[PDB]
DNA sequence: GCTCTACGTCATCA
DNA sequence: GCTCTACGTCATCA
């Protein structure tokens, strides 16, 4: 039987990570490894990884899970991205965690000025 | 016979002004009154009247005539607006021709500021 | 720790 | 005198 790629034990995958993000990952393992499997909102992807609307709205570039906006179902739908995908793109984009942190430095300096 | 609203004489309206912009105005009268009937690109509307993409892209708000982009038919289509409509909406927005010149003063100063 | 876009410039590519 | 949007911030309203 096919096994979880993290633990190599469980055979029952997390429905969301499996069906939406195509990751063969069990629910316990998702919770133990949030550094890979945590689900990030659209707003968090902008803040933390400096991804833009053009990058995040590309359906060819990230898997996403949509849900009703928790503040109101009349507001625009919440979109959730898996950390490992977002992070890998942002690393190619800014040049690794080093690059990302430099970019974070650059912006904070920008903001200190204003 | 229905007559041109500027001259009150011609019976044959400018096809573009009549068909696209709904103005009962003859071609000669349009050439004589560019201050009303001149066709402005999308870009001129932004430059001259500070209208935004959201206003100009509103199909309920301006009549527009599209044409192939004259630089290349692979580029975005040219959009032409009629000055009377664009001007009338810009006067409501900025507070008449006076307010528009003010808004112009402001932005030229902003650009000077940045040097 | 929700999302979209206006506010406004401007280059670049299309 | 061509047009769309990224580049970026951020409030506001949705
Ligand atoms: Zn597992
Ligand atoms: Zn006439």
Q: Supply the DSSP string of B64-84, one letter for each residue.
A: -EEE--TT-TTSPPEEEEEHH
Give the resolution in Å. 2.0
Alpha helix ranges (H) inside A13-94:
15, 27-32, 34-37, 42-49, 53-57, 83-94
C-beta of residue A41 within 8 angstroms of C-beta of residue A78:
yes
Rounded CA separation B25/B3 (Å): 8
> Domains in chain A: how many in total?
1
Distance CA B76, CA B109 (A): 32
Find, among A46, A26, A30, the residue nearest to A38 by Cα: A30
* Of A55, A50, A44, the residue nearest A100 (C-alpha): A50
User: Residue B85: helix, strand or coil by DSSP?
Assistant: helix
CA gap B93, B27 in Å, rounded: 29
H or E element in which residue B41 lies:
strand B39-41
Cα first-last separation, chain B = 59
Distance A37 CA to C13 C1' (A): 37
Q: What is the CA radius of gyration of chain A?
A: 16
List for chain B the helix, strand, coil content (%; round to 5). 50, 10, 40
Say how many Å lie between the CA of residue B31 and the centre of ligand 2: 10
Kindly tell me the sign of the dihedral angle through the C-alpha atoms of B83, B89, B90, B91.
Answer: positive
A 10 A CB-CB count for A37 gives 22
C-alpha–C-alpha distance, residues B96 and B88, integer Å: 8
Q: Say yes or no: Cβ of A77 under 7 A from any atom of strand C.
A: yes
| Residue B27 backbone phi and psi in degrees, to 5 | -65, -45
At residue A81, the 3 state secondary structure works out as strand
| Nearest CA-CA partner of A84 in A46, A54, A51, A40 | A40
Q: Say whether A66 sits in a helix, a strand or coil.
A: strand
CB-CB neighbours of B90 under 10 Å: 21
Instruction: Calculate the angstrom distance between C1' of D1 and CA of B35.
Output: 16
Neighbours of B24 (CB within 10 A): 14
Half-sphere exposure of B42 (CA within 13 A, CB side): 16
d(CA A22, CA B114): 50
C-alpha angle A33/A35/A41, rounded to 5°? 115
Three-state DSSP class for residue A40: strand
CA B36 – C1' D4 distance (Å)?
A: 28
Residue with tokens 């507001």: A75
A79 touches strand C (CB under 7 A): yes
DSSP structural state of residue A76: P
Here the tokens at position A42 are: 């659209």
Residue B4 assigned as binding residue: yes
B28 φ, ψ (degrees, to nearest 5): -55, -40
CA distance A111 to B55: 31
DSSP-derived 3-state class of residue A82: strand
Instruction: Kindly give the interhelix angle for A83-94 and A96-113, rounded to the nearest 10 degrees.
Output: 80
Nucleotides of C under 7 A from a protein CB: 1-10, 14
Residues around ligand 2, an ion, CB closer than 5 A: B 4, 6-7, 10, 26, 29
């Amino acid at each position: 039987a096919p096994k979880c790629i993290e633990c190599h034990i469980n055979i029952e995958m997390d429905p969301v990570l499996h069906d939406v993000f195509k990751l063969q990952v069990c629910k316990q393992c998702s919770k133990e490894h949030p550094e890979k499997y945590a689900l990030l909102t659209k707003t968090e992807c902008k803040e933390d990884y400096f991804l833009t609307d053009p990058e995040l709205n590309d359906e060819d570039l990230f898997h996403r899970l949509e849900k009703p906006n928790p503040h109101s179902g009349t507001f625009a739908r919440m979109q959730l991205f898996v950390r490992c995908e977002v992070e890998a793109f942002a690393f190619k984009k800014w040049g690794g965690e080093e690059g990302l942190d430099e970019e974070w430095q650059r912006r904070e300096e920008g903001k200190a000025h204003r």
